[PDB]
Design a protein around this ligand. Structure first.
Ligand SMILES: *[C@@H]1O[C@H](CO)[C@@H](O[C@@H]2O[C@H](CO)[C@@H](O)[C@H](O)[C@H]2NC(C)=O)[C@H](O)[C@H]1NC(C)=O
Ligand SMILES: *[C@@H]1O[C@H](CO)[C@@H](O[C@@H]2O[C@H](CO)[C@@H](O)[C@H](O)[C@H]2NC(C)=O)[C@H](O)[C@H]1NC(C)=O
Ligand SMILES: *[C@@H]1O[C@H](CO)[C@@H](O[C@@H]2O[C@H](CO)[C@@H](O)[C@H](O)[C@H]2NC(C)=O)[C@H](O)[C@H]1NC(C)=O
Ligand SMILES: *[C@@H]1O[C@H](CO)[C@@H](O[C@@H]2O[C@H](CO)[C@@H](O)[C@H](O)[C@H]2NC(C)=O)[C@H](O)[C@H]1NC(C)=O
Ligand SMILES: *[C@@H]1O[C@H](CO)[C@@H](O[C@@H]2O[C@H](CO)[C@@H](O)[C@H](O)[C@H]2NC(C)=O)[C@H](O)[C@H]1NC(C)=O
Ligand SMILES: *[C@@H]1O[C@H](CO)[C@@H](O[C@@H]2O[C@H](CO)[C@@H](O)[C@H](O)[C@H]2NC(C)=O)[C@H](O)[C@H]1NC(C)=O
Ligand SMILES: *[C@@H]1O[C@H](CO)[C@@H](O[C@@H]2O[C@H](CO)[C@@H](O)[C@H](O)[C@H]2NC(C)=O)[C@H](O)[C@H]1NC(C)=O
Ligand SMILES: *[C@@H]1O[C@H](CO)[C@@H](O[C@@H]2O[C@H](CO)[C@@H](O)[C@H](O)[C@H]2NC(C)=O)[C@H](O)[C@H]1NC(C)=O
Ligand SMILES: *[C@@H]1O[C@H](CO)[C@@H](O[C@@H]2O[C@H](CO)[C@@H](O)[C@H](O)[C@H]2NC(C)=O)[C@H](O)[C@H]1NC(C)=O
Ligand SMILES: *[C@@H]1O[C@H](CO)[C@@H](O[C@@H]2O[C@H](CO)[C@@H](O)[C@H](O)[C@H]2NC(C)=O)[C@H](O)[C@H]1NC(C)=O
Ligand SMILES: Cc1ccc(Sc2ccccc2N2CCNCC2)c(C)c1
Ligand SMILES: Cc1ccc(Sc2ccccc2N2CCNCC2)c(C)c1
Ligand SMILES: Cc1ccc(Sc2ccccc2N2CCNCC2)c(C)c1
Ligand SMILES: Cc1ccc(Sc2ccccc2N2CCNCC2)c(C)c1
Ligand SMILES: Cc1ccc(Sc2ccccc2N2CCNCC2)c(C)c1
Ligand SMILES: *[C@@H]1O[C@H](CO)[C@@H](O)[C@H](O)[C@H]1NC(C)=O
Ligand SMILES: *[C@@H]1O[C@H](CO)[C@@H](O)[C@H](O)[C@H]1NC(C)=O
Ligand SMILES: *[C@@H]1O[C@H](CO)[C@@H](O)[C@H](O)[C@H]1NC(C)=O
Ligand SMILES: *[C@@H]1O[C@H](CO)[C@@H](O)[C@H](O)[C@H]1NC(C)=O
Ligand SMILES: *[C@@H]1O[C@H](CO)[C@@H](O)[C@H](O)[C@H]1NC(C)=O
Lengths: 211, 211, 211, 211, 211
């Protein structure tokens, strides 16, 4: 048997996707996320919505999906379908349409249990857009990523990279459109409405000025 | 075996989603629902429809999905996929398009059998919108949630929170659009057209005035 | 074991959805349908199409899905997923878009074998719409429901209610739009193009006048 | 056991849908197709596309799905789900959008192995549309049906009816729109770009003149 | 048993789609791709996007899906569903909408392990489109195909045909629209942002001038 088949069987023959992947339920499943803005397709002042094509990547630890490489021909990482494992319900609020985003089939996994998921997002978000300074307008829209259902005690959200590095990330931006990206400011806040439930969310402020 | 895996197996290995989850068929499955209006994307007087992005949550009791925590490492609640259990067919009438709403994978469950489902709704509804007072127009549109098929003897709908608390809920509303939310008035009515079938529905009146 | 679980197992453990549910293949599967017009969202004279939100219900007999209540705690009816049983391919011709209609998960079943399916339809249909009498225009569009594939010898279509009762049904119509419903006239005709195939269809004429 | 259940089991318990249904791989799977134009919803000169609602039917031979009627209560034909058998990948080129077409669940089968599939098509096609003779314009758009992947040695396309009968078929056309159908001219051609691959396609020229 | 059934069983009874199909994980899975532009449906200068209907074909080697023909009635190639095997996640960046593309069910396979996949693409891409020379405008938009997740060490992209042959390929182009195709220039580049990850992508520049 090839090493990849042996590893895939050893991992997925005694694993189910319904549960949260932690040996002890008392610890939360920390999730690290990163956001890169690839392009700004449209900014609609009439409907007060804008469309952003952002490259979204996140990683977390699956305490069940771990192995010793030396028993599997020194395989340090491998790719398996995303639908065959647990995936956090980290969803972006303020959204109005996300069907344009295709579902990426595969995700990378490492022998430590770390799971890496790279996916695109064609999300269109609703935010306040004033046209007061139309000729030299500058807008401030926010993207907030949160565990839609799980509380902070179950899922927590952190940053993959340092805040300053992602704040001035224009490496892959399409810098030929009507809008110019000035920065992507992250922000962490604990969101709570009930007297006992606290939810963790990460706000990304996309700052753009017209040209 | 970890406690979560043992509990998930003990629950879902002797459970099927086709049936209504009640030990005795003679009792109805009471469902408690709540509605929070997150934003009002569009109000179309031409087509007599308006779009509301509302945060919808509901809970009910699954008399099969109950356990004693002390036998499962004091696990009081856990999350499992929504497609692995019975879910009431509580659908909103007056609707014209609901495909924009994504399907939330997971739902929370407690050892008492209570099931909590949090989902978003991008429903666009058809209702009478007069433009008689255009400059200072005030509109009155209604959202009615009902068990589409099940009668009152099978599914009944109630309110999660007290009517007054939800009537003046502007905690998460996007209060920067063209429309301002004045209140969300609930109302319970037994709907019957045949001589023997009674259906329970809950009407939510979204009161909005232009600005 | 609870009665519902026992009944569901007894029914679906020896049943498959591919076949037409009849003990003898020589008899047709009579289907009774009813149509209620809930609203008329749009009437497009430019594209010669109109959109109707109609509440559609139908029932038929599954000769396999029958039981004696006294052996199942006097259960006279129960609900199971619609995808777990055979469903007739009764489709509406003249259609141009039906994706807006959501798929109802559950259907009601009775111990006699009768299956009741209640579903909504957001169908937009193409029909001749003249604007000759624009100010006082009256239109005559038709909805025809037919077994798309099965012939009359396999599937036949009938009326749930008497023709006169459905002809003057304005009980749930949204009587506040630009159009007023005058009647819904049914009509049964055997449709045949080949020399040996006869298909049964039921035409519903929606009569509307502007206001 | 009822005859239908016995036949369905005998057929589908030793059958899989992945393969091409032929006892000997050396023979092609001849497919006969027919096209009936039900209506012409739109003809867009701006985008150089037109929408045609055509009734599409095809049949082919499944050498595995054959039986002797006398052993199954003289059952000469039966209907089973289309997703439970092999279906040719006969797709229409020049297309721009086909999502509007619903998926028909069932297909008819005969004891000889013949499979009959009736499905609708809401295809919108891109073709050259000149507006030179606008007031009395006549257009010539083409629909070509081909085995998208399989070569002629695997799948071949033929005509269900004689070319002249389908060429003057206006039996079910909606002859009340802006366009009038003059004919549907078929044409068979072997399409080859590589030095060894030949693909069979059938071109249907829809001839229409404005009125 | 027919040869096709025996071969399909022998192949798919000891094969799973999750893993990358290579006997040794240390070697990359080279993928050869080709692009043919069938038509240019729309070029939107307002939204800075254009729609291209391109015929996309690719092939790769599955080291598990190989056999000796002489043991299977000299079967040199056969077709099986695309969802039953591993398929590379070769996705086109700069995209804005790909849902219009239908999913081709079957793919061709040869006894050497080679897998051939032919699929259409209705991708709409975002690229800089200047209207400076409107009357005689010439545009330069790019399509880049990359392994979205897998690095170069896992998936690599090459050209099926020689660069010059694909650069002047107008064999199946719809040369009757507003735009004329001047060439499709390929280009290979190793894309890397992290200090250790290198991804292989192939850029196709579609050169078009108005007429
Ligand atoms: C959830 O994650 C956030 C972000 O990683 C945590 O907030 C940080 O916690 C560390 C350690 O307590 C502090 O040094 C930082 O100042 C906090 N803020 C940020 C922005 O890093 C938070 O403590 C985590 N909570 C739980 C329950 O895991
Ligand atoms: C866009 O909005 C964000 C959030 O309100 C602004 O970020 C804050 O700016 C204030 C300015 O005094 C700082 O004190 C905060 O520390 C910032 N917060 C974060 C998380 O960075 C941002 O400045 C706004 N941009 C523009 C151009 O107005
Ligand atoms: C279905 O639920 C509704 C709402 O919970 C019930 O209506 C209430 O019933 C209680 C007790 O009978 C009354 O005190 C309230 O005044 C009723 N109205 C409201 C708005 O709470 C109804 O009785 C339930 N019916 C069934 C069959 O369960
Ligand atoms: C919007 O419509 C609702 C329902 O018709 C109104 O709510 C009712 O208002 C009347 C006013 O006399 C009260 O007597 C009822 O008790 C109310 N019913 C409920 C369930 O609250 C509401 O007032 C309307 N709003 C506006 C601004 O006209
Ligand atoms: C298919 O159903 C239709 C409608 O139920 C049948 O047509 C009726 O048949 C009865 C009895 O023969 C007549 O009394 C009615 O006048 C017919 N028309 C209507 C509108 O009810 C038809 O006979 C059925 N055919 C088959 C083969 O079952
Ligand atoms: C709309 O069209 C239907 C069908 O053509 C009309 O219904 C027929 O009307 C004629 C009038 O003489 C009657 O003789 C038929 O018996 C009717 N058929 C049915 C099935 O009811 C209807 O009258 C038309 N409505 C309008 C307003 O013109
Ligand atoms: C594929 O099918 C086409 C159409 O049925 C075949 O073309 C016909 O072949 C017959 C017999 O050779 C001729 O008499 C006709 O003149 C041909 N044309 C038409 C329009 O019928 C073709 O031979 C078939 N090829 C294969 C390999 O099966
Ligand atoms: C539409 O185009 C088709 C295909 O080019 C035409 O059909 C051909 O017409 C020529 C006229 O001399 C004949 O010689 C061919 O035999 C026809 N081919 C087929 C397959 O029928 C058709 O005439 C065109 N229609 C119009 C109105 O121009
Ligand atoms: C990935 O594939 C590309 C293209 O096939 C390779 O690049 C070529 O490599 C060959 C041999 O090293 C050179 O002769 C060519 O000049 C290269 N460029 C092109 C455009 O062909 C690349 O080496 C491959 N890399 C890996 C790791 O497999
Ligand atoms: C469109 O853009 C491509 C890429 O920038 C151009 O292709 C390059 O053109 C330069 C011209 O000096 C050559 O030196 C490069 O070798 C070309 N690269 C490739 C990969 O072919 C192309 O010329 C542009 N077309 C137009 C009309 O401007
Ligand atoms: C009173 C109150 C309680 C809770 C909430 S929150 C919420 C409500 C419904 C559906 C989903 C949510 N969310 C939970 C955490 N993830 C984001 C959405 C509110 C608004 C009021
Ligand atoms: C005469 C009559 C009987 C019943 C109804 S109701 C209905 C009809 C068709 C499809 C669905 C329904 N519903 C049932 C309960 N849930 C909401 C929809 C009518 C209108 C007339
Ligand atoms: C000559 C001829 C034969 C049959 C028909 S019918 C048809 C054709 C193709 C696809 C579907 C159908 N239908 C069958 C019954 N259900 C409605 C649609 C025609 C038009 C001509
Ligand atoms: C050089 C060359 C070779 C083959 C083709 S064909 C093609 C190409 C890609 C994807 C699909 C196809 N098709 C095959 C048969 N069915 C219709 C589409 C071309 C254009 C050039
Ligand atoms: C700092 C940095 C690191 C990696 C990338 S890449 C990327 C990021 C998120 C999601 C997907 C990707 N991709 C990987 C390879 N395939 C194309 C997309 C960037 C932009 C910055
Ligand atoms: C795996 O790695 C260890 C440490 O580098 C080495 O000793 C061993 O030979 C390797 N085994 C294989 C099969 O590569
Ligand atoms: C569970 O809770 C009970 C009561 O608080 C306690 O006695 C017991 O030790 C707990 N068990 C575990 C495993 O935490
Ligand atoms: C079922 O109904 C019959 C007739 O009414 C009655 O005699 C019997 O006791 C009932 N059984 C149960 C369990 O309700
Ligand atoms: C089947 O048909 C044959 C020939 O017509 C006849 O002899 C036989 O009795 C039939 N059997 C049944 C069960 O109808
Ligand atoms: C397969 O091909 C070989 C070589 O051409 C030939 O000897 C053999 O007879 C063939 N077998 C069949 C079954 O065609």
């Amino acid at each position: 048997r090839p090493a990849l088949l042996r590893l895939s069987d050893y991992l997925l023959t005694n694993y189910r996707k319904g549960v949260r992947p932690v040996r002890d339920w008392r610890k939360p499943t920390t999730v690290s996320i990163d956001v890169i803005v690839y392009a700004i397709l449209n900014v609609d002042e009439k409907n007060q919505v804008l469309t952003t094509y952002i490259w979204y990547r996140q990683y977390w630890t699956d305490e069940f999906l771990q192995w010793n490489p030396e028993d599997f021909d020194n395989i340090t990482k491998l790719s398996i379908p995303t639908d065959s494992i647990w995936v956090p319900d980290i969803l972006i609020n303020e959204f109005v349409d996300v069907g344009k985003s295709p579902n990426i089939p595969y995700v990378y996994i490492r022998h430590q249990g770390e799971v890496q998921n790279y996916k695109p997002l064609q999300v269109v978000t609703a935010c306040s857009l004033d046209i007061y300074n139309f000729p030299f307008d500058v807008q401030n829209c926010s993207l907030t990523f949160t565990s839609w259902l799980h509380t902070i005690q179950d899922i927590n959200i952190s940053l993959w990279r340092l805040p300053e590095k992602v704040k001035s990330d224009r490496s892959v931006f399409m810098n030929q459109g009507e809008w110019e990206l000035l920065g992507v400011l992250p922000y962490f806040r604990e969101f709570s409405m009930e007297s006992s439930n606290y939810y963790a969310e990460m706000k990304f402020y996309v700052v753009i000025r017209r040209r």
